[PDB]
């Protein structure tokens, strides 16, 4: 197999993807600007990635699913309009699965996700909002949104797991390893963790290691008042949220990879997001996996019901 | 078909049986007391007997699926409370008590009973090990608490799960029936206190059976007001131990769909765990009931329910 | 032909209001044989789907909850200790059969009129109260229409349901399944409207509920609300309670069985703290949207509708 | 009571047989003033289930096949290009409410004469012909002892199944779905049963076919007798020809919403391909055992059923 | 704002064909570096389901055809002995993003032309010859299209499906998927159309079949038509042979992820048989109507798909 | 020490061993006082599944088989009656997962299986019916088969897969091997193979290798008067009939772990099992995995199907 074939290959698949994400965002950013009235819209980057996932990959074709599942009423809990593309408008999908078969290497796929999201951010007033994918997306994202908005965030991460692994599998992009990567790098200052029910003793470490602030199902009822008045971001380049749909007791959304009985109920999602005070200028909705999913896709729509409440509180 | 044979057949496979159970709990004894640091570990006994069920006989297939699920890739090997699973003095397996090749010798249910509490008692004479067994319908819990009682000298009190109280006097003319474990155990006095939660299915000859027997049923539309009692509890001060039966029945359906019975309005599985983990008491046996994986959905959900119910069991249980 | 139609119309609808009638002789004579009865809890289908907004599969549920009340799994004993076998506890009276009716092409102004009438002989048995099985929720507004007229003035309601269900205008259709409490607050047929379970209700509807003076309790509030709604007390100074339970209520992790599923609904347990404790003479009831068409193959949601059905029919029948 | 349930048999089922004479003699002259037709294949279903052994959900069965025939994700011709929406083709009277009969302690030989004087109603009315919706099997007698009293000699059968159903005795129960073609060939009501599909028969039933001259393939032998299956011609000397289809006749792969699954059963185009074929005056038939409770999520037992009945009313409407 | 959609319209395209070319000029330069190869199916996926009339999950198809390839239960040789590891047998070029150009305000002439071009943008590419992955059955014509207009001549095509997709007008989309065969046959694309599996067909469609000289076969015909199946030699005369092959052509029990359930339908082994035997020039092909949200849990319609395109591969690849 | 773990595999297998012993001895017993029998088919459950390549749930098989066995008719199509022990028993099981749990390694392993097989063949009049498990364990069986008989058998053999791989990922032992082994060991003369759709060009230089009789689903039709007229085991010590429910069409028998579109019908298996020539004296049904079958379980009923006309060919 030729040497040269593979990397202009490479370049090229990648440039071509990426000049795609570019003239969308520069047509929904000109959009925006045209109707007017609007600080920020919720913009929609879909990473069809699943490859980093220690169990399933189905996580790769959930942003499509996820996107027929919003756009099929049209108001949000809140009664934000969904058919305004001021509130929520799509970019696209990051064409992972033809980047890959280019070659391209985990380090070099992980700059194309953050290059993307940069060429949201780029066109005033798009706010990326990332589908997953699973959540290994979130490093990548993360980093991109730190690196272009000069400095550190505060996270609020749903999750049944802390993905705070040094080392899982020798994988340093597994999907159990992004605030690893994350806090290594700086770009979070805070990191608020809520629904976590399955963590190891080394991954103590970590969280103590870094100041994260791990709240854990067996102490939920203890901690409902400061989640429901959670304030972030205050002296920092905002706030991001990462909501991994695993976070949900698996009664509610089937549709992952990794069941986790004793979970969050959605009303604890969405008291949370809801109440949730701070300058959100990212987030992602990650571990949808359609084909774990119901026949009648409850964890679609679950899923697209928690991304309609990001659009809400992101939009402005 | 001779007697003659059919008895001979009976005495020997139930032998044979025996002595299996007895070198696989030889092996995990030795192995937990020559790793030392360990006052107790939860050994997991297998009891595959569906036949005592009035609905449906496939948690008979429960075992194996509880151990795989245990043992399932998706999942790591920490309880929520931080104890490591991959520790042998924290979890083990024994084995499956032969429940189908021992019937299929034609021996009555009596017996079958009585091999059930030899088996559990061939785990309990290897100390460290303490008896964590996976059913099964709910009728194993007699002879398993039988054994408990008949080897610690006296009575435990228990702490039980269920949509059903199990106290039926006479389900179906059937002494071992799933329906009467309870009513067998409070007959023997093998149990001092029975707290039961979870309960939104009972017939009023069995509420004159709660009452005669001074069991503590908590009924679901009296939960929120047993919140404080449940989230505290204190057993076994006084008698021998205390033992911790989970019918997994006890969990709404929309969390538990893989049981025979559905009961609608159940338990969050957030609700058992808090009453485990808040539970004082020296645990010396348990067991996880009812899971039927013919009625599970096709991802095996209720597979992990009934192996994270056996994890934090353990956690408990193991010291 | 214009007669031929008139003809059909009237003798099919009133061969089908005289089973109806006989059924509910029959069932009313044997309780009042048996002695020791206020009131008899009886079920009547009406297997109407056709004015659902997205899924017409709820015409199917009447006998699904009725063989799923009688089945294998369970006990005849209902949580609080009444026994269904005693015929005094609960009884079938029949389904109307709609889609005959409809099929002689009957508009559903008529068709309203006949389930309003179908409710009525059976009110007109004593000790038999209806508890009817649907069918998508229009059917609630000709059956709270007829126990209206029937005990002659209002009746407080309480609601369970996901959507207010209080639409002027669901796309034209005046008996939407989207508008029934809106027709029975218009015609003065209830007092009290305490609706419990909402997480899906438009500006414009909001709006409806100021207008009308409606108990709309939200799901975000629901933890606080909580003592209020176990401890509800209606009826008082009016001619009783009518309890409408829509499945889609419950969260659809418990009832998948539903046309509209909308995530973080009620636990069985939020319907049963509230119906339990309910405190008011209980006139009649429903249990509508069960859409066995969209449920698992266990048949849960069949088992979850029967349940809401036997702990009505405990709480009505005395 | 003793006069109590009596008076009660008697008002119920008068009731019951008085609303299906209504519809009938609805579609009777609806067809007559549309004119051009010799036959219209009508649909009675007979919803019950209790005869069966295994599980009694085929008493759902009717409404859910009435619904996949005039459906979404198919079109309206059948194979051979009949339309459907033309009410000569097929049309609807209605249900058999066998519930609410049998709850008024109504005996099975009662309720066989009801089911009987059911179809004698709808053949009553020129030019319907009965095309009747179980069900379990235990329908067909009934049904096929009714068309033919009313036609005064015997029919000539053509039967799918993977059973025999030739049992004198299953476990007591004279009005087994395992033993309907056994009360037929007894009562001397068909002269040929030419039965396929069949892979379940025990010796003892064995000798009963060669008892009454019965003509059973078996699934060995299909791929041999495809020349003889897909040439029948049946009903010549006598009244005519009745086709009754057993579901479970169909591989469970095909049809898996049935009660007794059977491995190695018929292709769907192995009944088109006998059914399309058949010569012979079809005067009445039954499609039964169809479980809605075993179907699987998008309800493909319900639209093989609705294409059975559809290609056989395409063959006996004319 | 005009100037604004005119503008990104454009680019966005440009960027999506931009994309496409890329792909199929790595894959051509690699399969040219390999030398030993004539013509390699290259996968084009189309996603796009928003012209079927029932639903549209045959969207979300391409993906998932490809992940089932490519699956670790299957090993990488084709039944009669190709090696899809060698690129030179299978290769991937990538997915037209449809949603995002119609998300741009693009009307469906303009979709189909861009789906046309991105057909176009592979076949430059010796040796790389179009296998295009549905999506539903409307992107039949556009491929077709730009197959027949590239090669400069019509095509004779092999076409498996339950329905003719032969209407002039279905529901006034002149795009419908039940309308491709219409505007291919009408534009003269092709000149024989032979039809595999037809079992749903109005009398309008059969006036349509004699009308063009389709070579439409019904499944009540297959036996009689076997051995013409079974040595079809299509193509001599013109510049090749496209097969399209809508995953529907199978029976309901073999591909249930379909939109359309048809019972009766194919077995796999019979689109296999005539594949394996057919003569002439392979020049395209596509696979269609595969929809994931109607497939089962595990996916098998995926591996029903996966197949046909690697048997269809191992047939078009030289 | 390594003393505790060699003393826990000595003991446990042995204990494992005397309990099939024990029972093969109990039915030998029933069928010789019961007489008018020559050959009763024996259940020997091997519940193994981690030689699979894809799902482990074949582990699960054995007792879904027998318990569809006993759940339909109680007559075989050809009249035999199973209620009479002498056309079909079960043995029992042996403890795969309990004596891996004690270390014993994958050639002690396939021991064990051979040794249990030999217990079963050591009471007249029983023959061995193996219910697997993934297919891995026909090798040790047939070995045991060979052996016990002093010399070769000749194989019917159903499967999607020829199972003729010299090298699965380094697993001597893998389900997509054991006809390697058994070929190699010279423990088959004639390999009679129906139902094959899934082969590669590396496992036809096997078949041409051992002289096996590879008939695949392309040529069926052409084939079908011969696989209904097979004669087999004339000159060698007998007949050997291994099922894998993978053979069948997934649409008849989704409970499997490997699909594979364009198998056999099930009157395909049927009508050759029915008409086989020669002394059947083995055979096992396996790759039936209950955690892929549909809810109704219709791939344990086919899979009890099969045992039954297998047991009433090798019954006499
Ligand atoms: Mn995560
Ligand atoms: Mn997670
Ligand atoms: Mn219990
Ligand atoms: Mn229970
Ligand atoms: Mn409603
Ligand atoms: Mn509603
Ligand atoms: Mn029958
Ligand atoms: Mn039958
Ligand atoms: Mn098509
Ligand atoms: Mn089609
Ligand atoms: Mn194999
Ligand atoms: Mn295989």
């Known amino acids: 197999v030729s040497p040269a074939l593979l990397e202009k290959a490479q370049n090229r698949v990648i440039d071509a993807a990426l000049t795609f994400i570019r003239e969308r965002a520069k047509f929904?950013?000109?959009?925006?600007?045209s109707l007017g009235g609007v600080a920020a819209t919720s913009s929609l980057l879909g990473v069809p990635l699943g490859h980093h996932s220690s169990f399933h990959e189905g996580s790769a074709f959930a942003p499509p699913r996820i996107r027929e599942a919003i756009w099929c009423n049209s108001?949000?809990?809140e009664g934000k309009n969904l058919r305004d593309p001021?509130?929520?408008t799509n970019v696209g999908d990051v064409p992972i699965e033809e980047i890959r078969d280019c070659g391209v290497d985990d380090k070099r796929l992980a700059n194309v996700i953050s290059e993307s999201v940069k060429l949201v951010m780029d066109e005033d007033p798009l706010r990326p909002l990332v589908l997953g994918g699973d959540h290994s997306i979130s490093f990548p994202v993360v980093?991109?949104?730190?690196e272009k908005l000069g400095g550190a965030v505060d996270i609020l991460h749903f999750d049944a797991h802390p993905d705070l692994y040094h080392d899982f599998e020798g994988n340093y992009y597994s999907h159990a390893s992004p605030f690893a990567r994350i806090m290594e790098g700086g770009y979070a200052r805070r990191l608020v963790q809520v629904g976590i029910r399955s963590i190891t003793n080394d991954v103590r470490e970590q969280v103590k290691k870094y100041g994260v602030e791990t709240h854990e199902m067996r102490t939920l009822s203890r901690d409902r008042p400061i989640l429901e008045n959670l304030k972030l971001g205050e002296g920092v380049k905002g706030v991001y949220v990462s909501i991994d749909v695993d976070s949900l007791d698996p009664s509610i959304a089937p549709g992952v990879s990794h069941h986790?009985?004793?979970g969050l109920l959605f009303r604890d999602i969405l008291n949370i997001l809801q109440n949730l005070q701070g300058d959100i200028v990212g987030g992602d909705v990650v571990e949808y996996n359609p084909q774990r999913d119901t026949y009648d896709g409850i964890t679609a729509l679950v899923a697209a019901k928690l991304v309609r409440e990001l659009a809400a509180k992101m939009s402005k």
Do not use: D, F, N, Q
């Open 75 to 77: 108001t949000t809990e």
């Open 28 to 33: 929904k950013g000109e959009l925006m600007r």
């Open 260 to 262: 986790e009985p004793g």
């Open 86 to 88: 001021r509130v929520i």
């Open 143 to 146: 980093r991109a949104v730190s």
